[PDB]
Assembly symmetry: D2
């Protein structure tokens, strides 16, 4: 053989991948996550899983053809979950998506049914994984993935409001003529219609915008900053109306979270987690609050100081989500 | 105003972008080129152009929303070519695509018609840009864009065989158990069924595979390495059949060329250029040969020593292209 | 020639660089600025300048030998300023450095004299550049460089407190178990002994540390957070005592500024700029305040709401600098 | 505590890093390896070891201070090897370095004595690590480290000719006006005076320079390409004569090797390995040959087909190293 005439093997020792990531679902969101992760050099192996065999194989092949231009030496795929073995991170992007004028909360029964099959199959092969839930409704589905997997809460994370806050900072950046990296502002609660803009923490270089304009984000606001949060809520629906779905911003948001987990950065992200005990919330509600994210998932929660109004709205977001949780049959 | 209570403006000046890239066409190919260019931090401004307004705006907004995760501070879009003013590089991804089982050569007239409108509009707003042609049949469309633009040949580049070569190195690497970066092999001529594998130059660490296997790539080869090239040829068809189209591999291949251009790397890439005078070729045929690629586009061409068999194959590829090319009127 | 047998030249176009950066001074600081800039791929051309012929050539050569691992195709050096022609960014690291126990302010006469020679020569060859002053005392030398150059104030930037702030954030991060990227805090004023910690602005996810601990930064503070600032002020001296000089942190700080400038990011950095007209300062004092940094240098200043105490501290920093500055002759 | 008012901890756990790198020795080379590894985002933990306590603490602090601009969340140091625990890769840059005009082989006994202390300590704390030997004479010290460690040969690697080859490629690139990435040349054998240029493998885009110029690298060669190899051999001497030592190029070469290891790349590098069984070498000689490098270190070796003269030159290099490997007492 040519290979043996060219190369002498000196070590047969087959090995386990050290930094493996799995993406479940090869729809537009799943593939945006995949390409983003590959372009950030986060994994030594990427596995893709779906139920549509041809689409799955075609997606994997297309990525494989780009290997010369990447630094992820192994890209694999299968409808079989054995292909996901030894993953450090499992990203769940499977399920029904909302039509225009349909709530993400309306996806609940359909996506819980899909999760009942995916979750156990996924956890089985990767004892060291963190579960990163992207599928909607993300908050409810992070709670669902937590209850089905039986994982500790630190290991089960929802992409939640990382994208909402990225949109909030883009929009604030645009109004102020400043890069989003230097515009700070938090959108917490549901990754949906009940999200909460934390006006009290909106700042540039530590300067509170609300200290400058105390009416910031109210109906009394001369510059109607509330319209920025309105634009954040309406973002998915405006883009869906235009191109039929969304994929790039979410793929980059998910890759941002994968980077913190894979590199143990311990950076703070507004992501879906269990908030029972915080803000007088006594139920097992999952929703976005600032979390410290690293190699063991969420190791810590940032206790944001909310004004009674921001706190009322966060509790309103938690009540909405709890009501929806009351519909779950396991 | 809040902005004025927060920020003291010291310079109101609206300066020209210095590293601008335009992508014409927001189909799956154009969007893969856009995402890859953004992940590679190649541009300070990205412009998108298409004819379908909602789609175009939606793609732009989706990319805009991921700004927090990027280093490209301005992403714009319009059907109007004024949006492309002062681009350093304009990437053409517009046009008809082949069906599964249809030659790229069969798109010629449809894409020539579209190029008759696109090219003068690009030239009007960026008369000093480098034109990178991706639309199929790439080799013929590069010639057509060169004829329409009136640009010198160095500034009209076709993505050509950059991808065929990346696929060849991926397959070679998978057979040898070596990363494609360390597997060298060139696929030249038409980015199509008449491409030419240069078996004489196929190597690992400067070790000629042909010196180890004199029948390498021939019908008489025991290991049938010619099948690797057949897999390169069938790549697009295979992927179109499974997923419906191709995008990721071409998007990374285009980002690779954009990088050599934007960064003046002077790396060698197998890309579409005029080959009149080489290998006894008399006509204005454009096809892939190893080119030195930098800030002024194609400055030089590497003279590959071809065997009588490889030469004959390239001459036939040149022959197939001119047969279509000669008939054209625009 | 072998080059002509291998390569056919198609274009004899001289080529002018598009993203050229010059580093004046090949001392530990200049070289740490160079390697960081090179590893962030910010330039297509790097030029080095010094007065020690041998040191200059050796450093230039050592960088050149790493070319295969870099994306900067041209590395050049000379004692002649013609080597720096057409730079977009010129980083000044030439000058005397302070001993242990000596103030950066004591370097003023030696460094003003050196700048009288350097600044006109840089300005002669790069009329479009941004001048980035690193040499000490940075705040006074920025003013000196601005007065000599004839450049508008937006294009004369001091590295200032970008380092002091990175140090503050690292220590804050270490205390909190959070990445410095998520620990916000600002050190303004002189890059020196009179720098000002803006406790009122110190926060994690928008949560004011001073709201949780009102005693923050005072002698009354049980956790002695004032010590974080004392460690920031003592940093250079502590590191000089241990290693003989500082280089890695300043090099990364400078490369951070180079990235916002070269890439037109419009990020907010605490860098040296004219403060006349803010905080009741009546003289042409240059010190660090949060600035929007882009392709035209400093376009805007963020007006920080300082507590009376923090403002008095800032005004004392300004007084300290003017004391030195008013005694200058050039 | 302010930390606890701000943060709620979910999980008080053992933070064993997953991608840990140790650099032993904080001289100019060790620090160039450290900066290059940090700027390539290869590790989640960097540990520095040295015998000079103040110099070590100063270097650690200086890097730590640049943390905000990095993605390596923990940088530590100690003279005690407990700090190196659970390293994936341990880089040895400790020992005497050569003076102007002193041979690397002259450092042999001083460094062997140092390796008798270092190697058992590294092994005690990271028994499963890959050992990357940089200290000179690297070929000999890789054999020394292998014998002392008792590690299998795949996990004991010498930086070897990776730098000699990058230099050769830079010089060839400069001569041809092509980026070093597209210029292929291999320098094998000792990283020093007896290194071997493989003229038969020198090429651009699979085009052999020797087929174009049959006298390439010989005395008869009109263009004197043998002078390119002489410059590779003289490089460290020329740079030591100019700047006092070398650092940038080796640091970048070492980070390149660290990248193949950490990311399981399976790239081919000319590195120090046991060559017993090749080219008529019957003894335990370590020297550079092309090696497939990944997560298990060197798993395979490319059998380079050398000319009778190139083979003779390699046997000569092997004879030189074995003669001295016999000068060893440990
Ligand atoms: C083996 C199996 N086991 C189960 C178990 C349960 C279910 N259950 C359901 O099927 C749930 C009901 N389904 C919906 O109502 N879906 C709403 C439509 O939403 C979408 C979602 C994604 C795209 C992809 C799209 C893009 O990503 O852009 C593209 O790429 O084409 C398009 C439309 C099915 C199976 S199949
Ligand atoms: C038994 C079974 N096993 C499997 C295995 C795989 C699959 N495969 C798929 O179903 C793939 C196709 N479907 C999807 O990709 N759906 C996920 C969409 O998730 C999101 C999440 C967030 C956004 C962001 C957006 C918004 O929040 O709306 C905004 O804010 O912009 C958009 C869409 C099906 C099955 S069935
Ligand atoms: C304002 C205008 N001026 C003109 C002038 C001329 C023409 N020219 C023609 O249309 C002539 C007919 N062309 C073909 O025969 N097309 C073959 C099918 O090729 C494709 C190509 C792309 C996709 C898009 C793809 C993606 O977005 O990735 C997806 O999924 O839809 C789908 C099918 C159109 C216009 S519109
Ligand atoms: C007057 C007018 N102005 C405009 C302006 C914009 C648009 N917009 C579009 O046309 C967008 C939709 N169309 C496309 O995206 N088509 C481009 C397809 O190009 C490629 C190239 C290479 C590959 C790689 C592949 C292969 O080579 O097959 C392999 O090898 O894997 C695949 C597809 C239409 C008009 S009409
Ligand atoms: C053609 C010319 N025209 C002029 C005109 C004026 C002046 N003026 C002065 O010379 C000013 C007087 N100098 C001092 O008092 N120096 C105090 C200590 O400064 C340092 C600085 C750096 C290092 C580290 C550095 C290294 O070791 O060199 C490294 O490699 O990192 C060590 C000590 C010189 C020239 S030369
Ligand atoms: C007529 C002439 N033309 C030339 C041309 C070139 C040269 N060449 C040199 O002078 C090179 C050697 N000199 C230096 O490198 N000195 C500048 C050091 O600048 C800094 C800046 C910041 C820090 C950060 C640090 C701190 O602030 O102390 C902290 O906080 O950690 C440390 C040191 C001399 C001449 S003379
Ligand atoms: C018991 C003990 N434990 C310890 C622990 C730590 C330390 N610490 C140090 O010894 C640090 C200071 N010493 C060094 O840094 N020396 C190593 C230099 O290594 C190289 C390697 C390659 C090149 C490349 C170059 C060339 O090959 O020359 C070219 O080709 O450009 C240059 C220099 C001492 C002891 S003693």
């Amino acid at each position: 053989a040519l290979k043996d005439q060219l190369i002498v093997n000196l070590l047969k020792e087959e090995q386990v991948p050290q930094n493996k990531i799995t993406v479940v679902g090869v729809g537009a969101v799943g593939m945006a996550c995949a390409i983003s992760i590959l372009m950030k050099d986060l994994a030594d192996e990427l596995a893709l899983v779906d139920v549509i065999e041809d689409k799955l194989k075609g997606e994997m092949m297309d990525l494989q053809h780009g290997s010369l231009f990447l630094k992820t030496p192994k890209i694999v795929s299968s409808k079989d979950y054995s292909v996901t073995a030894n993953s450090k991170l499992v990203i769940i992007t499977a399920g029904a998506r909302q039509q225009e004028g349909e709530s993400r909360l309306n996806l609940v029964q359909r996506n819980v049914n899909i999760f009942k099959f995916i979750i156990p199959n996924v956890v089985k092969y990767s004892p060291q994984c963190k579960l990163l839930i992207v599928s909607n409704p993300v908050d409810i589905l992070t709670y669902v993935a937590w209850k089905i997997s039986g994982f500790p809460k630190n290991r089960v994370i929802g992409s939640g409001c990382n994208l909402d806050s990225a949109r909030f900072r883009y929009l604030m950046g645009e109004r102020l003529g400043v890069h989003p990296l230097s515009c700070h502002g938090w959108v917490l609660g549901e990754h949906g219609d009940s999200s909460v803009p934390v006006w009290s923490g909106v700042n540039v270089a530590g300067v509170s915008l609300k200290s400058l304009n105390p009416q910031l984000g109210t109906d009394a606001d001369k510059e109607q900053w509330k319209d920025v949060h309105k634009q954040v809520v309406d973002s998915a629906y405006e883009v869906i109306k235009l191109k039929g779905y969304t994929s790039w911003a979410i793929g980059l948001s998910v890759a941002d979270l994968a980077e913190s987990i894979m590199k143990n950065l311990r950076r703070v992200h507004p992501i879906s987690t269990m908030i029972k005990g915080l803000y007088g919330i006594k139920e097992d509600v999952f929703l976005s609050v600032p979390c410290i994210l690293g190699q063991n998932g969420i190791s810590d929660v940032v206790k944001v100081t909310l004004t009674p109004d921001e706190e009322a709205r966060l509790k309103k977001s938690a009540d909405t989500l709890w009501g929806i949780q009351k519909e779950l049959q396991f």
